Amino acid sequence: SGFRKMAFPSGKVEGCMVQVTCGTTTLNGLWLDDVVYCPRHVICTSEDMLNPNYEDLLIRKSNHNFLVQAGNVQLRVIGHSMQNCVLKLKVDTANPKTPKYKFVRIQPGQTFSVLACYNGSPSGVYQCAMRPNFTIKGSFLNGSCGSVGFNIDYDCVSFCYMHHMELPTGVHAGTDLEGNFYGPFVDRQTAQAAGTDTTITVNVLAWLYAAVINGDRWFLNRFTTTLNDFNLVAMKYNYEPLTQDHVDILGPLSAQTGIAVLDMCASLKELLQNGMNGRTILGSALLEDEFTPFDVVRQCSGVTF
Amino acid sequence: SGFRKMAFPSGKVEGCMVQVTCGTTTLNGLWLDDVVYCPRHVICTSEDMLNPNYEDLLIRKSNHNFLVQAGNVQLRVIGHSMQNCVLKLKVDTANPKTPKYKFVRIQPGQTFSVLACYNGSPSGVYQCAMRPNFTIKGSFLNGSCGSVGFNIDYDCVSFCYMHHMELPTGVHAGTDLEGNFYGPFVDRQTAQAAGTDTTITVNVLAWLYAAVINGDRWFLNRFTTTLNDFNLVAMKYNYEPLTQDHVDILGPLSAQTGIAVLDMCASLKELLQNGMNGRTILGSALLEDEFTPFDVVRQC
Numbered sequence A: 001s002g003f004r005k006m007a008f009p010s011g012k013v014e015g016c017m018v019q020v021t022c023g024t025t026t027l028n029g030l031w032l033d034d035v036v037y038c039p040r041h042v043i044c045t046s047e048d049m050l051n052p053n054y055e056d057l058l059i060r061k062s063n064h065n066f067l068v069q070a071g072n073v074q075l076r077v078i079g080h081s082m083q084n085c086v087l088k089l090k091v092d093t094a095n096p097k098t099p100k101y102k103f104v105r106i107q108p109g110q111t112f113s114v115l116a117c118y119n120g121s122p123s124g125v126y127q128c129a130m131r132p133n134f135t136i137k138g139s140f141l142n143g144s145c146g147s148v149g150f151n152i153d154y155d156c157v158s159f160c161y162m163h164h165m166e167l168p169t170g171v172h173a174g175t176d177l178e179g180n181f182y183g184p185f186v187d188r189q190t191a192q193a194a195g196t197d198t199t200i201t202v203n204v205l206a207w208l209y210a211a212v213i214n215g216d217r218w219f220l221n222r223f224t225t226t227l228n229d230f231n232l233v234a235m236k237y238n239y240e241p242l243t244q245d246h247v248d249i250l251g252p253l254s255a256q257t258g259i260a261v262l263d264m265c266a267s268l269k270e271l272l273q274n275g276m277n278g279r280t281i282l283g284s285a286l287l288e289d290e291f292t293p294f295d296v297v298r299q300c301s302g303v304t305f
Numbered sequence B: 001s002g003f004r005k006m007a008f009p010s011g012k013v014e015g016c017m018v019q020v021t022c023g024t025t026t027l028n029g030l031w032l033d034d035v036v037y038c039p040r041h042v043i044c045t046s047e048d049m050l051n052p053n054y055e056d057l058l059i060r061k062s063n064h065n066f067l068v069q070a071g072n073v074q075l076r077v078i079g080h081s082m083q084n085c086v087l088k089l090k091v092d093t094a095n096p097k098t099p100k101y102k103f104v105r106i107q108p109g110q111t112f113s114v115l116a117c118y119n120g121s122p123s124g125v126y127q128c129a130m131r132p133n134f135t136i137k138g139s140f141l142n143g144s145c146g147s148v149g150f151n152i153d154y155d156c157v158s159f160c161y162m163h164h165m166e167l168p169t170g171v172h173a174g175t176d177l178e179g180n181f182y183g184p185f186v187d188r189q190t191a192q193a194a195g196t197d198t199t200i201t202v203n204v205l206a207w208l209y210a211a212v213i214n215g216d217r218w219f220l221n222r223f224t225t226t227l228n229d230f231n232l233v234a235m236k237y238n239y240e241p242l243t244q245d246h247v248d249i250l251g252p253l254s255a256q257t258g259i260a261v262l263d264m265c266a267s268l269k270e271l272l273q274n275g276m277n278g279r280t281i282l283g284s285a286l287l288e289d290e291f292t293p294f295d296v297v298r299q300c
């Protein structure tokens, strides 16, 4: 029993974190095989950030301008290239701790673990969801750039996020490991803002199933609803639309608990229209949307890595 | 910016998790140097869980009755001894991945990371706190016994918890790594219950300071309180008493934010009286008590 915000074990990723310094800027790099990936903004001064021409700034750098430190060992940079907003530093040593890995770009609503790092040293691990507005509500201080987000599927680490910036509202923006930003963000010190966010409906439903599995049923009711009537309610309360794909994905949890997905939608509809009435669900007074249906099944079944 | 429930990176502990089997029971063990630590209840059969005589059950076991698996490699048990409720299996191989470590017994209110494991394989990491009633609100299924709780301040792993059981309310009980249970619990299936739990006041205050550091001040007020009046009010909401030790511990956060501890106590009193009025504090509609003053300073 119990339901916690759980991250994947971070050990496979910890063995890849390195420190990357370029001039006065120090941030984190991800060392996989003979390449260290890091935000391309490591080459910018504060003034360069106002309107950077990364190709022009990079052509001026030599390999020896990138100091890469893996623990207390300096790696030698033997080449450098840019892919979108990520800099790829070719090093002379393959990381012996390189796990089986892939680079995957995730969709909004998908969750991942973030290994927050400073100076190439991991400091904490937490679970995030890619918000519908393409930001993440992370916990990052100055020096955290280059920290990565990932999932593990069996023995394979799927890297999905690399940290680049903090927006004025305190939320975060980054890229996939191919350097493509999530969301309409750019790596430049210019006016940027997180758009209006929405709640990840399929994830709230998954968490209500987790609550039922853990013995909380107060919110259940005799009612059901159609997908169109529920979607009219979701639109009204700034919830993401629930698709037939989401309903199919929730099938296993629907079969296990005996609560049909649309039956749980009628529970969610009543919660949106009336609130919790002083009650809590899994120790929360808010509807939690950062657990996917897969996370719920994984935690309530004990899948290991 | 941002404030998350953050666990320590688990890699140093992942390299210590092993599977321990005795008869039909399989659980997790913590392999450090040449010793595998695990709950002594691994030696119990179906007829032993109500009034086990662990000394009597253990004397009957030979080293080859303990099957220890580290990855896909069977470790050879060459000795065994019991220390309180933990079994210590001496193995013929020191764990090459043994980190710098210590065993620390924590006090209620302290937080730690849990690396939940099944069959010696880590499945997830989460943060939790030792509740005032000596239980933890963990996430553990059958087979999670032997999963450990730890902190990793300054590259040294301080192991503070080893999981043993789930109480009827769904909360969890365990021991320190010397096998001493936290709370009045016993490794027996006899009727046991978590005592009435309370909110960790010092941690709620620490989290309100985190909220102020992160730019949220809506809950502040023009009032202060005496420590004793605060406690009289707080006790009525099932909050733990706030001691002068807690006030001293909150000194650094008070100096950083400019909000006196007793002024923050007045804000807490008002939050208890009023609720949040549709507002949130650090993304929460409830007052969070699983961040210590030390965690707040570490994360901010």
Ligand SMILES: O=C1N[C@]2(CCOc3ccc(Cl)cc32)C(=O)N1c1cncc2ccccc12
Pocket: A041, A049, A140, A141, A142, A143, A144, A145, A164, A165, A166, A167, A186, A187, A188, A189, A190, B001
């Ligand atoms: O290190 C950087 N450089 C920044 C600052 C300048 O403006 C930009 C503009 C674009 C880009 Cl891609 C990065 C940056 C940025 O946000 N971060 C930070 C990342 N995350 C958290 C931060 C917490 C406090 C302080 C800075 C943090």
Ligand SMILES: O=C1N[C@]2(CCOc3ccc(Cl)cc32)C(=O)N1c1cncc2ccccc12
Pocket: A001, B041, B049, B140, B141, B142, B143, B144, B145, B164, B165, B166, B167, B186, B187, B188, B189, B190
């Ligand atoms: O593995 C065990 N053995 C138990 C079962 C019998 O009663 C006792 C009594 C004393 C002791 Cl020390 C252990 C045990 C126990 O609680 N757990 C479990 C631990 N944690 C979570 C569990 C989630 C579901 C099911 C069982 C879980």
Ligand SMILES: [Cl-]
Pocket: B105, B106, B107, B110
């Ligand atoms: Cl302590």
